[PDB]
Amino acid sequence: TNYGTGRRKTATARVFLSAGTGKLVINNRTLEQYFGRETARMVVRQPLELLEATEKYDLYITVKGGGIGGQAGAIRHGITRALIAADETLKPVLRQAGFVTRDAREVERKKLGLRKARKRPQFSKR
Amino acid sequence: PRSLKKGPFVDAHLFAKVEAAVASNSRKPIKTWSRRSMILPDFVGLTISVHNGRNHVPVIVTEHMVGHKLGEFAPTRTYRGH
Amino acid sequence: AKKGMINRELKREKTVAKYAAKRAELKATIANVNASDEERFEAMLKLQALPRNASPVRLRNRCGLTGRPHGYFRKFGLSRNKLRDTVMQGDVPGVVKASW
Amino acid sequence: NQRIRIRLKSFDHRLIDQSAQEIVETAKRTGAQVCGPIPMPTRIERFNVLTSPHVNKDARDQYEIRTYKRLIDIVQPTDKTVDALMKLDLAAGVDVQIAL
Amino acid sequence: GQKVHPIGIRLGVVKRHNANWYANPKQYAEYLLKDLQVREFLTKKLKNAMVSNILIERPSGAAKVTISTARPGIVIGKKGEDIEKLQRELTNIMGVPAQVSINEIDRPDLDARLVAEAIASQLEKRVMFRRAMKRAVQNTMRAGAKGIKVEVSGRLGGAEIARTEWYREGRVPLHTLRADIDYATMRAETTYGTIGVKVWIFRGEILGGMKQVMN
Amino acid sequence: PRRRVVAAREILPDPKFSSQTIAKFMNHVMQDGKKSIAESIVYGALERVQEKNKVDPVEFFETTLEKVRPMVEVVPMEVRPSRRTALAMRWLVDAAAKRSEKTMALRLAGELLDAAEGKGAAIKKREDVHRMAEAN
RNA sequence: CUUACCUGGCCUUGACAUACUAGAAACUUUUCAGAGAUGGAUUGGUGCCUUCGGGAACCUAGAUACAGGUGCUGCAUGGCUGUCGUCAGCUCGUGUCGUGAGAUGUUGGGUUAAGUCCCGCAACGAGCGCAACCCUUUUCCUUACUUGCCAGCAUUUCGGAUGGGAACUUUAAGGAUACUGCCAGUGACAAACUGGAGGAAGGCGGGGACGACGUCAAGUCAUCAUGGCCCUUACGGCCAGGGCUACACACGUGCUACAAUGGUCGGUACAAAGGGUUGCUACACAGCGAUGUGAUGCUAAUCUCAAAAAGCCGAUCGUAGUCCGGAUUGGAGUCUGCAACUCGACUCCAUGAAGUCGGAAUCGCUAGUAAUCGCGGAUCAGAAUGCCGCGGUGAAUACGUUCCCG
């Protein structure tokens, strides 16, 4: 019934949160069949574990773009902002835990005369 | 190499000359610049002077040579050691 | 470039346009499967008997103003030296310095 | 089924916005219903041009040119609308295509 | 020590393009080549008519050439036959019907190219090079610009060793992108080789941005 | 840096144990950004030690790290606490690189086990460093 | 071809410009000799405007002024570029001091990334530089609802497929916001510095473009222009074949490895950016394969290149010059192209070299960075390990200025 939007490294997640009994679904798949690696699953589950309210909600999630880490970060951000839209008093705790900030780090462009963003070709005096 | 579905490539001015030589029995060498023409069975037993850049070197065609390009038997670079 | 090279390119471009239709027809005949193998073989011989400059494989893109054969940039038709000047003085529509 | 659809292309988004705004304002005058303008993704193409005449590979100008596009739909148009839009004056730097 | 082109750097920021047309990728090259031909032809044909700026428009299958001039009488002609003759010649060159519009400059001393042409003409008319640039500087400053810089380079005075002189008066903020700076270059052909002339003229800042310029 | 003072970055607690020291150990193991491979190695090394002797992995790791930590370095000077953990971790991972046994998980578990008792190239490194320090 | 070089075959007012003179529309077929350049025959056509006396287009023929030159001088030059170096400095007018070259201003205490800012002072005032205005990324709002989207309803072949909806993601134009603004210290109770709350973001948030007066007789007469010199039956122009790809050696910049944090096989997820009508191709059939044939959509938010790869799960290999490595060579082919011998790319079978982490020495990098994995483009018939871009995963370490370099 409440909505959140999360973003991280070209990935975008839209999260619908409602009252329920812990049913979580991402792109018509369960969490364990969607995210193969396990740190991603903790990253997804962190906001509800902090609030001790794992079993009090149902989550319907759709994510697009980026990779496995970025999508997990975007889902976490979306869950946090959905919870904040649900209750405004949880924002102090969520900000203290640090889930509210949008991570603005992104890939640096390649530059002329360089092999990468910063790496240079090997140099020689003679 | 050249695709099989196309067949062998031979220059027309060389082919007409070699066919005239076959029809007659001339033992005069044929003189050509066509390094890119491939040796056919009709070439066997003849003498072809192939250009190498500066001179025409003579090639006596045997049975084994059939299938190669004429320029394979007239090298273009000169090397004797350092 | 020298004037001779520029004129030589024009001569090649003229021959190509002169023989384009016949060359296309012969290639179509070669590709035709219904025609007899004898017909295809004669089509191949005529194609190989066409003059060398009729083949488009021998044209080389040159700068429209100077005739330079390196650094061509199809989209403008000019080599880099004249492209830079004409762009920087504001005569090429839409082109600006790029930053991102 | 009558629905005019118009596509605009340009190298300048200010000009393309001027044209699209003026077109929709013209159509509303005749009273038909308008959908749009819908901004379509922009095409960006980029070039690297050596600046020195002889030899400095790291000295380049980087130029870009952009193509902007807009799409408009006129639905349920009256008789006045078609000829009014066809009468509408053409502005330089903008290409307009009208389809039935 | 190498400086970016003052018009190129602020193209699309406060300054518009001299060419304004759209073309598909397969027509861009031919359109551009014919436009360059038109510019090269007009420069030679109006070498003595104080022409400064040429603007080319292609609305649809037609061309509009706007010539910014300070001698409209010479360009148009006594009866107006010259504009028709120019229109015919340009129509032949472009392969499409063409029309010409004249735009008269009111203050020639505020314009970069006219000043550079005057200095170059004097230099090949053998005036001492230091008088010409002082004359041009004070003429523009009295005409009411906010700054001007003039530069001449080459075998000045027919010397064996070439050198560079320059003279500036007022404000010339080259690094400020919104400044309205006009720039031109010319070649003076003398007995001893080529001399190069460069002029910068600053006429205040352009406020409001290209939104105000209405590009 | 000659101009200013940098702040050490904020590493995140491990997901499965919630241990910053274990997360740092993973970062020391990882190469080429393969966090999953590093995590697999660390967990495989922990489970072997847990099975061969039944202790809680977090406490066992902390206690072994405390044994391996060196008190003096490189003219002795005194180490800061963070350098203690860094040096101990780097010695701990380096020894398993040269050890016998085929796989790296067991290669690391062997060092973890033997360092608890007191035999291992990691502890010999601390021994030699302290011999040098006491010499000077 | 490019091509400027070599061998040989050819032309001479020239392949190209203008002026003078005469004749032919211009053009077009077919054929022969030759390696071709060239030469000789054979056809058809004979056109447009026109105070129609002719003119225009175009060619040919003759004549001389000339054309032509990637020939030389970057130490005669223009234009353009590198470098100190994104270093923080560099100058002027009017006063005053000194016989004079000159000085002062611009110096001294703090502070900053900075000649950035505050205070004092025979100095009083200005200009170019520094910052800012420009592009891009991070949060929110308005306009816009298709070719893009699918939360609520309905159908369903369970494919946004369909009726629909305008919510959300996105697309892309215009705006808002961050200013030491507020709180606590500090300073001289100046400038400025250090902590905290709110906030997507806090002290210059990240990246790009923008290069001061000048130096190096730095680079470029082979992009182009240009003074002077030089060749003009040849240092100019046309052609075929060869060379720029040579090979006792030496150096620079890279790619692939030397394996188990790995190799092979099976199953199975998640991107961004860009290209496509002489083009990209769904699908089917043939082939072990590169590819071939038929056929379908697309001038593209519509169809296509297109398979992301590393990742996850299962099996196997068990430290061996190996199921590591993939050089070299024999055989058989595909495609582009008039033509792959010198001298192309790719496919299949066979072969299976050096290499087990590299001496003295030396290089890059301070965060979405290094490392590692794949994807695209310009040039281009074909021919990238180079160049220019795009995203995925994602570290370690900074006590400090004693030494090296600037």
Ligand SMILES: NCCC[C@H](N)CC(=O)N[C@@H]1[C@H](O)[C@@H](OC(N)=O)[C@@H](CO)O[C@H]1NC1=N[C@@H]2C(=O)NC[C@@H](O)[C@H]2N1
């Ligand atoms: N491949 C080389 C071709 C030959 C050159 N192009 C000829 C050239 O340039 N001569 C120039 C020229 O006469 C002129 O200079 C200008 N600018 O006209 C003068 C004025 O200095 O200087 C000459 N040169 C010098 N060099 C020497 C030097 O440096 N010190 C000592 C003395 O001998 C110097 N002079």
